[PDB]
Design a protein around this nucleic acid. Structure first.
Lengths: 465, 450, 465, 450
RNA sequence: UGAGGUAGUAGGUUGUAUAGU
DNA sequence: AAACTATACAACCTACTACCTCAT
RNA sequence: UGAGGUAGUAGGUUGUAUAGU
DNA sequence: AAACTATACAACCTACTACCTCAT
């Protein structure tokens, strides 16, 4: 009879080279490693958005609490946790008059209104950071709810995606401009109420999570790295391969794969893959031709050589579809004879639902289920001893992982992916289901394939999340 | 000699700020003494407090919170601090702290009004800064900053009831292995006894067409009462293949490949189980890609089966539990049962829209936890099981499939500790974060609920 | 009988709502207007450049003075004057080896050397903007002097400009990145000598000027405004018409006339002038065509409406060469009725050397010799009435301003132009002879005519200094 | 009590390293009475410090410079300083300075090695922060920080005044008045006696060739020596016009306009001026536009003319003064004069290169000031003056022009105070801003001038 | 964030419209 | 030139691969 | 940072090379 | 058609406009 093996909780580093296990507690207790002075924030929107912006900005300075300190830790203050100052003054403000919106609302073409509102925000931002002397590091664009409830694709009176922030980031992408979207209902829920009499966007008790998420996003798009991971042997690359296909119908995509990688720190170098006219989606199981495969590998290895000067000893390929012989032989020749390459497939559609006999608790995070050397399981979600609660909904579901080709240890890739599912930046959560090389994959594909005019895209992370 | 920093505060409402100050002070170099990290349960508290205050305490750190001015312990600590302050003759001994803007400066006691309290209200970073430089100008001895001791204290006291332990714990799946498998396949070469327009689902027993052949576990005498012209068929023309070679992966012939062998095996097991679950007289439902059933209200006795919950009503809506199956043979010869839930307004018909069903299912989901779902799964499996050890399938007139009614349990080496029942309401709050972070076109369908 | 009408020196504002004169005084005694947190430190170059930059910044967090304080006022340090933070750490360093450059030096192609060396700088700084996760505001670039002597156009072994600064600003202009040129000898004055031993950059007595200039430049590329002129009546905009002959244009009768405006701060509006026929061989004087003048003045009006929300009360046109009636009539057609337009030209080559007999100082600055209501002088060079020193190496040379078109008081426009000579930012000087609208003229024209790949330049100003 | 920071050093050296501490401490909130700021000339150099050492000196600051450790008074002050150290019993009285790193630790006298010295060799920010620490540890009385007193001192310590002073002071210009003007300009219509190939500027008198006539000042019988055909011409055909109309501006005729005729009079003035000033037998220099003749070496007596150093030598080259002139008429009938100075390396021939001329003129222009240029200009004009109150032109055989030798003096109602010759050295230091600020492609010529 | 909701084909069936030694 | 007949792709038969909402 | 130093064509001289009637 | 004779600019002959480098 076979049993379940366990993988220990991977540690993350903080200030002064010390290791912890909780991002919130570990980043409040010690702080960021590479410190910056701070950032100037600029807003574009109406005056109601500006006064909402200020109210929230001041609230974020003063400390806020929760109902317990076990699951959601308190917020001691932006300066107390990061070491950077945030104030009410020196905020660049660009306003928008309601007459333009009221006159332009009555067009039948919803996509035309989406496009011209997006270009209005775009060229206001472009002028604002191309005319004014005062520097702005993060642009907090605020949007009202009328454009969110009356200018939807299904409102009742193709390469550019219809959603707002997608094409906003894609259009601001080629001018090196970080920005962050702020829905007006997110930070002004005191008076934003429905007809029934209960705030549907309720934060009467979870203000701390908003503070943590906004502070972490603002500090990551500031320039400073919040945290890194613990153990990296010399010469290992976690090449997370994007498999985000875009949904354009008559424009032939046939492939929209990209790739991300983590080498020594939390920074990632995501290079745009090919437009990929190979193997039209009637055969869309993604068997990559040798030339695009060696192009992707050459960009990955060249960025590794540029940032670390040393040859990669081992290359890990994080994907979500099967690999075959011709693509493997294409991958093998360009990589040197000494190094080794291994590909893994992570999927969610595979079901396995373990239950627990007595009590009222789920299966705890860290256990692994091994069937063969080829295939194994890992419980990325479930109960966690640190938070004294769970992270899934009613039942956790594992991820089916299996090495496609190449010799390696299965528990090694188990702890490697368990370490990789900790580096989230947009959300200040303990952990999430898919690894961050795959969690960022959907968003990076979703913005980088939504703009066909970009040929030399940025290789950073701020201009996307 | 005296070198210790003493913090008097109001536990447990002020535990977080005190933990912050104590950990950052011990990480910055200063040795601190507080009732959080030193005074644990089971020890005498006041004698140590007095001895540390009048023996090794260099400076006194009192907080002025809303509850930190009318409690007895903080007042007594302030009184003994005043006594030792008068003994040492040092007005730079008591350093008050204010952490609440709701507190007015005229409400604090008379021992706080004479000295200027250090602000910790609008921010804490410059509060730590102006507490730190005030220590140096008072020339208190300090040790070099080492955060290694802070990590040890954090792992020692703040990770005591929130870390994994070493005890065995058992867990059960939804997987039901195939205890007995048939010996031989049955391929039937008819070639003119089946019309081209024939649909193979109309048969009372499962079969699949294979290029000139009919594959099943049934016999040539099984198809008599609906195909009259199968009487002239001779059984010698049929071919048979042992299932041990198919299951062990050692069979690979030119006439049918091993992948195709296991594909027909799992597919024919799938519709055999579908026809058997149809034979149980259970009401149907039109699911998107699979075929799940649901038990009728009023059939099960007392709405109970071995004192368990399976079906009921919450808000004028009879909620009916159901399962779905899909065979699997890659890790083991096992059948997987999936969990599903659909509601009925009256108990006879269904709901005319799917959006209301999905929204109401997600509404009803959070009221119970995985223990109830386990009871539901085991209840439906043991109710469907005509046999008490397995489910009597219906694939032929003489040969059947035996699927066990109990799941394959998986036990782990080490697991968690068991806290109280507050965590279920905490997970309901976690569902409220799930509400509060993501939402998409929630207006029309919510307005269509009344 | 002729007298010299003297004009008092206007005072520029500073922090806390108070005014001063000599900017560095107000600056090293009162502080800048708006406070910045700090400046992003970033260098690109070799190892010797990194170490000399570290040593120089280690010199400049320490106050350094000059031989006499009657020449230059006191400088108490970077932090005590600016209030912004600067270290020896968090220095992002991009390495460039010396083997490839030495390998490419051997050919006779000096222009291709210029192209690939500046491209090697540009792609490195662009990748540092993109590959690196942290954000850089100010970049510092050094250059070995071996390249500076062995690869000059006159050394011995077409619309662009041979200057490195010009093409660097043009090439980085569409990327919104400010960068400062830093000579190796200027920052290493202690060891850089000839074979005789005297320092060519003999900075042993002028280190205060060097510290002031470098600090002011590094602060202006951050985005802070150091000073603002005292008396602004509301509704004025000074249009300083750039005049630069482009002999490298395909048409010998072609040039460019961009626009520079100062309305409420030291921020200019860099709007590129088109490449059209204004040069002529029979009058020798650039007359604006009707549509070009209409476009220039209308875009000036739109810029004023965008930055001030109200119509300008008066608009002053500053230039170098005189006008004719057709462009004036075109200007008035795109000018509102209640607004006044004055055309002012500024010439330098006309000599009037008013010498003097006895006393140890020349003609002071502030005098003027009027001829009529429209053609006059202004003595902006000479003895300073607060420094007790003279700025003119020898006899001050005056400026012959002429009021060709427009109706305004001669003393008022004289006051306005001599007050406009108080807004220099690249050099920490008390004031300059010609107004800064004509001092920035050569820099703006040279940068805009340094590359043909410029479509529309930014309105900002830090990408030029 | 004790609140004063005082610095000692050799007056000529460390002019910065004492004003550094003085201005920093007076701007950071401390009363400072030091040598450069308050002990000017005429003040006793020992008694004030002898009173301050026993009255208000908190810390004494001494720079162990190259020339400051051999004076008697400072060492005797150190002796009284250790006397008050053994009187008041404070060993932290003297804080030494170390700016000249060429001096070693075995060179200072025995009176300073007994106490620790704060290092000033890496950076001085840690020096000022340790000075502040030494201030706050011994509890020195002080004033709250304020930079207003420092600025209002700095603009009134030895900066004498920054306010306008109303007193008369005379001026002079470069414009030269013209006493005698030609009475009549004439147009000679020879129409066939002038060859096309014959240049009209080769004449001994100015004559310019326009389409039917010659604009000249010479009579009809003044060109016999050059053109023999002139005698055949009858003088009544020429038109002959007065100059009162051009100087007063009422000349309006259709054939010849006004602005072109002012251009004509300035062209004739330039030509006649060139002829006359080359008639003085003065050696020339080659530039692009004008002809600036310069006085030959050995022509002037003993290198002096009316108490004025005109020419001379600068370490390898002989410098000779000259002028270039171009008339102007719109403001007044004057003759503008430009200042030129020509160099030669033996007094015989010119320097072949032009960059050598420019660089040498720039390097010699830093020595003296404009008073010397007044003397040189006046001497050159008086040497070019034949009579006492004018300069005698050579224009024709009977008509001559006289231009005033004295310049057009101007007057002024506003002048400032005049210090001694230290301001000339101050201007010389200001002249190094050219080297300090900007330079471009100068090394290739730098390696060639030697 | 996760359990349903949707069109489409991974890859070995059998029906369109031929044309080969 | 002509006898048999499978040819040579290719439309389709039950479910493996990312998609895109749904409201907790 | 100011008195130049380079080409060259401002405003008006007279050769290139033809067509008006 | 032929008896006129200046065209109709407009490249260059001496002299007024913005580059540019040039250093102590």
């Amino acid at each position: 009879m076979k049993e379940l093996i366990y993988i220990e909780e991977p540690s993350i580093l903080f200030a002064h080279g010390q290791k912890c296990t909780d991002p919130r507690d570990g980043l409040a207790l010690f702080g960021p490693l590479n410190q910056i002075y701070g950032i100037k924030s600029g807003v574009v929107g109406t005056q109601k958005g500006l006064q909402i912006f200020k109210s929230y900005l001041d609230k974020i300075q003063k400390p806020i609490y929760n109902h317990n300190n076990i699951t959601r830790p308190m917020f001691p203050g932006f300066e107390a946790v990061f070491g950077c100052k945030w104030e009410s003054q020196n905020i660049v403000f660009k306003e928008i008059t309601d007459e333009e919106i009221r006159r332009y609302l009555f067009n039948a073409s919803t996509h035309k209104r989406t496009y011209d509102l997006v270009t209005l925000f775009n060229d206001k931002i472009i002028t604002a950071n191309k005319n004014d002397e005062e520097r702005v590091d993060v642009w907090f664009v605020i949007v009202p709810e009328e454009i969110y409830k009356y200018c939807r694709p299904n409102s009742v009176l193709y390469n550019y995606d219809a959603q707002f922030h997608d094409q906003l980031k894609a259009r601001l992408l080629e001018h090196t401009i970080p920005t962050q979207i702020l829905r007006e209902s997110t930070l002004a829920w005191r008076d934003f109420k429905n007809t029934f009499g209960a705030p549907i966007r309720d934060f009467s008790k979870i203000e701390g999570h908003l503070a943590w998420t906004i502070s972490t996003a603002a500090y990551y798009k500031a320039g400073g790295k919040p945290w890194k991971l613990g153990d990296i042997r010399p010469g290992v690359c976690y090449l997370g391969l994007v498999y985000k296909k875009i949904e354009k119908s008559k424009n032939p995509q046939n492939a929209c794969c990209a790739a991300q990688m983590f080498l020594d720190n939390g920074d990632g170098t995501v290079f745009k893959g090919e437009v990929g006219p190979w193997y039209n989606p009637e055969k869309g199981e993604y068997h990559l031709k040798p030339k695009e495969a060696k192009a992707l590998l050459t960009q990955a290895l060249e960025s590794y050589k540029e940032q670390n000067k040393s040859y990669p000893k081992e290359v890990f390929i994080h994907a979500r579809t099967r690999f075959n012989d011709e693509e493997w032989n294409a991958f093998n020749e360009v990589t040197p004879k000494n190094t080794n390459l291994v590909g893994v497939t992570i999927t969610k559609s595979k079901p396995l639902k373990l239950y627990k006999t007595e009590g009222a608790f789920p299966i705890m995070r860290g256990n692994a289920y091994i069937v063969d050397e080829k295939k194994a399981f890992l419980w990325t979600l479930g109960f966690v001893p640190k938070l004294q609660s769970t992270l899934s909904m009613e039942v956790p579901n594992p991820i089916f992982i299996e090495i496609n080709k190449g010799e390696a240890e299965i528990q090694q890739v188990l702890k490697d992916i368990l370490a990789l599912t900790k580096l989230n930046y947009n959300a200040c959560i303990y952990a999430d289901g898919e690894p961050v090389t795959l969690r960022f994959a959907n968003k990076i594909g979703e913005i980088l394939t939504a703009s066909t005019e970009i040929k030399t895209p940025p290789l950073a992370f701020k201009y996307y999340i | 000699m005296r070198n210790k920093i003493f913090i008097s505060h109001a536990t447990p409402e002020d535990d977080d700020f005190t933990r912050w100050l104590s950990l950052k002070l011990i990480g910055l170099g200063y040795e601190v003494w507080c009732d959080i990290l030193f005074l644990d349960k089971g020890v005498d508290f006041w004698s140590t407090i007095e001895k540390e205050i009048r023996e090794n305490t260099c400076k006194f750190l009192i907080v002025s919170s809303t509850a930190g001015n009318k409690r007895e312990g903080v007042l007594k600590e302030l009184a003994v601090a005043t006594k030792v302050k008068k003994h040492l003759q040092d007005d730079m001994f008591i350093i008050p702290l204010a952490i609440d803007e709701n507190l007015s400066y005229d409400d604090i006691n008379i021992e706080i009004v004479r000295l200027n309290a250090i602000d910790f209200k609008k921010s804490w970073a410059k509060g730590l800064q102006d507490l730190l430089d005030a220590f140096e100008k008072q020339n208190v001895p300090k040790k070099p900053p080492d955060h290694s001791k802070s990590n040890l204290l954090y792992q020692q006291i703040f990770l005591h009831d929130k870390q994994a332990i070493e005890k065995e714990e058992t867990y059960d799946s939804n997987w039901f292995p195939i205890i007995s498998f048939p010996n031989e396949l049955r391929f039937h070469r008819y070639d003119w006894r089946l019309p081209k327009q024939f649909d193979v689902r109309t048969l009372a027993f499962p079969a699949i067409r294979y290029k000139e052949y009919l594959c099943t576990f049934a016999w040539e005498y099984d198809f008599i009462h609906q195909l009259p012209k199968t009487e002239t068929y001779n059984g010698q023309e049929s071919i048979r293949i042992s299932t041990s070679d198919i299951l062990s992966g050692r069979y690979d012939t030119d006439f049918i490949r091993n992948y195709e062998c296991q594909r027909l095996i799992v597919q024919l097991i799938n519709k055999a189980f579908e026809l058997r679950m149809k034979d149980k007289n259970v009401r149907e439902y039109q699911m998107s890609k699979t075929f799940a059933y649901w038990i009728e209200k009023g059939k099960l006795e007392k709405d109970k089966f071995e004192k368990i919950k399976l079906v009921g009503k919450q808000k004028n809506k009879y909620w009916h539990f159901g399962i779905s199956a899909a065979g699997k043979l890659y890790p083991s010869p096992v059948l997987m049962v999936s969990s599903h839930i659909i509601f009925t307004m009256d108990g006879i018909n269904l709901i005319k829209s799917k959006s209301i069903q999905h929204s109401s299912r997600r509404k009803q989901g959070k009221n119970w936890w995985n223990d109830k779902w386990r009871e539901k799964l085991l209840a439906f499996i043991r109710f469907l099981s005509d046999d008490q050890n397995a489910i009597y399938l219906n694939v032929g007139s003489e040969e059947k499939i035996l699927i066990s009614n109990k799941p394959l349990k998986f036990f782990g080496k080490m697991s968690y500790v068991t806290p109280s029942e507050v965590t279920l309401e905490e997970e309901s709050v976690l569902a409220d974060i799930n509400n509060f972070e993501e939402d998409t076109e929630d207006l029309d369908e919510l307005e269509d609920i009344e």
